[PDB]
């Protein structure tokens, strides 16, 4: 009689696995984006200090 319990557990497990996969996908995406944006801002900031000493 516990087979329905087993099947329901399998279903919620599958749902949670899909959820985890989607969350990992969004995580790696946003992390690549944040790292790239930080690279750009650091580069251009150093460039700003260089053009500032240039102006000086």
């Amino acid at each position: 009689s516990l087979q329905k319990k087993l099947k329901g557990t399998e279903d919620e497990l599958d749902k949670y696995s899909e959820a985890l996969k989607d969350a990992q996908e969004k995580l790696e995406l946003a992390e690549k984006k944040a790292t790239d944006a930080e690279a750009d801002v650091a580069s251009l900031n150093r460039r700003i200090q260089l053009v500032e000493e240039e102006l000086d």
């Binding site: 650091a42 150093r46 260089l50 000493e53 240039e54």
Partner: protein
């Protein structure tokens, strides 16, 4: 037919066809051999990996460079490099294509002679030609005068050219380059505990250098800024994890180019050998040379190196001349681009060293007016 343009360099092979805008095969000039025993039978593993494959198998191999400072020291390794370049990266038969090779000024003559002998006997090319790297850089830059500073990975050299005439007595060559900068960074990174000793951690240190190092416009002020603040301190993530933090040695590494006493050398910085080459040239081409100071090669790719070079040369030269430094974004490939231009020039098709000329005059035919 088409000619190949193989810019051997010292630490990065760049090959392609004459008439293209860029090389189609850029890979490290390394040859790796396994140093452990190897247990899995049936693995059938090779005995030496060349090029970009060795960088994948780093953790298992010992990486050796066959070119120390322009000069080739391991001829079997260099022959493997060329075989890989011809057959695996380009996929061409070298017995149907002329080949243009490049070399730095003031190398031994046996280097060039043995290179020619290899290219005619082993690879069996129909023609070949050895060109100077700085001249080809000036071709690619669009100039016809100007003093070029070609800082590769083995050597650094200035070659002043005016109206297409080179002034050989004013050629300068310095043996400080990217390899010495990598060794200095390996050495000064131990002040924070990081230790890189293996021949395969040198590649990690080279990556750190390329991605984080920069030239300070003023060295004492950046020293003080790093001593006080922490705004210039940046992090890097090793292949293992365990991020490392780089402080003021972001700009102490390339400062060795302007203060070669850091690595115990006697000579003067690049800003000063450039000026000494100028002042060794004539008096009535110095204004043009000051105005056409051309940079090329990978070691000139640091952020701020052009501004630093200009500040220094400006403080050196008289106060009444416009000092200008030409630093294109495609600096690293300037020698190859110029080589492609030259080999495509229709006027050049009479400057090749044909195979019959070689067969009749020996390898000594390389130092003739084709020099």
């Amino acid at each position: 037919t088409t000619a190949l343009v193989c810019d051997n360099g010292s630490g990065l092979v760049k090959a392609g066809f004459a008439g293209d805008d860029a090389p189609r095969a850029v890979f490290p000039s390394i040859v790796g051999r396994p140093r452990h025993q190897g247990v899995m039978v049936g693995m059938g593993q090779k005995d030496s990996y060349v090029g970009d494959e060795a960088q994948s198998k780093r953790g298992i191999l010992t990486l050796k460079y066959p070119i120390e400072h322009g000069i080739i020291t391991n001829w079997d390794d260099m022959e493997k490099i060329w075989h890989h370049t011809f057959y695996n990266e380009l996929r061409v038969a070298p017995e149907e294509h002329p080949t243009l090779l490049t070399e730095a000024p003031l190398n031994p003559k046996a280097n060039r002679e043995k290179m020619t002998q290899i290219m005619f006997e082993t690879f069996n090319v129909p023609a070949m030609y050895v060109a100077i790297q700085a001249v080809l850089s000036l071709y690619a830059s669009g100039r016809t005068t100007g003093i070029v500073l070609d800082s590769g990975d083995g050597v650094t050299h200035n070659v002043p050219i005016y109206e297409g005439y080179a002034l050989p007595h004013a050629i300068m060559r310095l043996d400080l380059a990217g390899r010495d900068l990598t060794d200095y960074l390996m050495k000064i990174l131990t002040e924070r505990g990081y230790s890189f000793v293996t021949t395969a951690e040198r590649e990690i240190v080279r990556d750190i250098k390329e991605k984080l190092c920069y030239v300070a416009l003023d060295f004492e002020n950046e020293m003080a800024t790093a001593a006080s603040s922490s705004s210039l301190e940046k992090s890097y993530e090793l292949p293992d994890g365990q991020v490392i933090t780089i402080g003021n040695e972001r700009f102490r590494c390339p400062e060795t180019l302007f203060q070669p006493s850091f690595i115990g050398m006697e000579s003067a910085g690049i800003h000063e050998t450039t000026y000494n080459s100028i002042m060794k040239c004539d008096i009535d081409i110095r204004k043009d040379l000051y105005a056409n100071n051309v940079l090329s090669g990978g070691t000139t790719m640091y952020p701020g190196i052009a501004d630093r070079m200009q500040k220094e040369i400006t403080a050196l030269a008289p106060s009444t001349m416009k000092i200008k430094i030409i630093a294109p974004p495609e600096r690293k490939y300037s020698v190859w681009i110029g080589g492609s231009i030259l080999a495509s020039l229709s006027t050049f098709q009479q400057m090749w060293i044909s195979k019959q000329e070689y067969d009749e005059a020996g390898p000594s035919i390389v130092h003739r007016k084709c020099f």
